[PDB]
From a paper:
We then solved a 2.3 Å resolution co-crystal structure of CTPɣS with a KorB∆N30∆CTD variant that lacks the N-terminal peptide (N30) and the C-terminal domain (CTD) to locate CTP-contacting residues. Furthermore, CTP hydrolysis was abolished in the CTP-binding mutant R117A and also in the CTP-binding proficient N146A. In the presence of CTP, canonical ParB self-engages at the NTD to create a clamp-like molecule. We similarly observed dimerization of NTDs from opposing KorB subunits (with a substantial interface area of ~2,097 Å2), supporting a potential clamping mechanism. Based on the KorB∆N30∆CTD–CTPɣS co-crystal structure and sequence alignment between KorB and C. crescentus ParB, residue S47 at the NTD was substituted by cysteine on an otherwise cysteine-less KorB background. Overall, our data suggest that the ability of KorB to bind CTP and close the clamp to slide on DNA is crucial for long-range gene silencing.
Long-range gene regulation by the DNA-binding protein KorB is important for stable vertical inheritance and horizontal transmission of the broad-host-range multidrug resistance plasmid RK2, as well as for the fitness of its host bacterium. The best understood KorB-mediated transcriptional repression requires a 16 bp silencer sequence called OB (operator of KorB) and the small DNA-binding protein KorA that binds site specifically to a 12 bp OA sequence (operator of KorA). We find that KorB binds CTP to form a protein clamp that can entrap and slide along DNA to mediate long-range transcriptional repression, likely by allowing KorB to reach target promoters from distal OB sites.
Residue numbers in the entry:
A (entry chain A): 52 to 252
B (entry chain B): 52 to 253
């Protein structure tokens, strides 16, 4: 098993590669992971090494956000394992060697929850995200036909841009379809911003 | 500690939110995490639950890439903990509730390694990335002045775009400086592509 370690006994590593400026150490970001820890617990135990200088204490290998989130959530302890064979490169590995769910995969998860009758509000809570994040992904579950093609072929991949394109389609469907019908037309945050403006003239 | 669990006792969860199409299940991606596992081990133990249907066996809560990477690396076992109180939402949490190092933070780590005399090739290996990835970040350690400002103020944040902007600066420094001196000028993959082309005519 993992050990439940008193937070009082744990120090952050001052040479960790994540610096103070990192978005992930913003109060909002710690609050976000913190809420999931309050609800579900830390699900991936942190890695610590024994402090050689102060026996009985531990230094974080990986897990500073889980640690700060645990404090935010009012936890007295955190699940952890001891690994004294952990180096600075491993800390960068922990962070770089991982891959996200796609927007489609997130939408489809939301879809399966909606199909079971769960409210958007509760779907937000159980994954620790905002209602606006749910809304943006839900858009992908019922895309207009031409926009769906562009999304599936990979001609546009960013959920925010897809949403902006749908919002335009609702107000002016013929004009957006003719813009997509051009093969030279790339789809970026920028080109869509240009399309929105063209349509308000 | 974590248990070293026989890979033969572990099955993937067929309702995991990562699907077959996901870039992270590509052979190249499994090879990438696999190399780090071959060298360093799995450093974050996977989470499994007991299979109720098949006693003695386990289903993956989180850890399918670590699992496949372990197989790629020729491992017979994988570090794991048992959590029988794990649901489908937790699987999406494991993945969405995490934040990257910035490009600056990655460059500066590389910087610290270079300053100790480590070669680029060994820095690539120890973080499981390609030489080209190292190169693109190393660019950030010696940015021309005006590009540095734009990078630091957040006017451009993407490492790829910064590299493209440096490469343009090398060939036409006066013209790139005057392009950055315009406040209306946004800096995107697109605008820089437009700048590259404008310069290849003159
Ligand atoms: N030698 C390594 C390299 C990476 N990792 C960890 O492996 C995880 C990979 O995350 P992800 O890409 O999301 O894949 P898995 O969670 O393993 O698989 P899945 O999300 O499909 O369940 C990260 O926590 C990373 O720190 C590790 O434990 N040891
Ligand atoms: N309820 C939660 C929410 C998230 N996580 C895990 O917390 C980690 C967050 O990773 P990251 O953003 O990189 O932060 P930490 O690794 O905790 O901190 P650091 O990288 O700064 O050492 C991920 O493995 C995620 O799956 C968890 O164990 N339990
Ligand atoms: Cl710092
Ligand atoms: Cl507690
Ligand atoms: Cl990714
Ligand atoms: Cl339609
Ligand atoms: Cl699948
Ligand atoms: Cl082994
Ligand atoms: Cl991130
Ligand atoms: Cl200069």
């Amino acid at each position: 098993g993992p050990i439940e370690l008193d937070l009082d006994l744990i120090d952050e590593d001052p040479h960790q590669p994540r610096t103070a400026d990192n978005p992930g150490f913003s109060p909002e970001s710690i609050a976000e992971i913190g809420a999931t820890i309050k609800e579900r617990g830390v699900k991936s135990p942190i890695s610590v090494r024994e402090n050689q200088e102060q026996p009985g204490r531990y230094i974080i290998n990986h897990g500073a956000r889980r640690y700060r989130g645990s404090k935010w959530a009012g936890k007295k302890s955190i699940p952890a394992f001891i690994d004294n064979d952990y180096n600075e490169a491993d800390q960068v590995i922990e962070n770089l060697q991982r891959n996200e769910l796609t927007p489609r995969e997130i939408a489809d998860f939301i879809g399966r929850e909606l199909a079971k009758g769960k409210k958007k509000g509760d779907i937000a809570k159980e994954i620790g995200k905002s209602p606006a994040f749910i809304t943006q992904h839900v858009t992908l579950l019922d895309l207009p036909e031409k926009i769906a093609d562009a999304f599936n072929t990979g001609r546009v991949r960013d959920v925010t841009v897809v949403n902006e394109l749908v919002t335009a389609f609702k107000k002016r469907p013929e004009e957006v379809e003719a813009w997509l019908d051009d093969d030279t037309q790339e789809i970026t945050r920028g080109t869509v911003k240009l399309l929105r403006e063209f349509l308000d003239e």
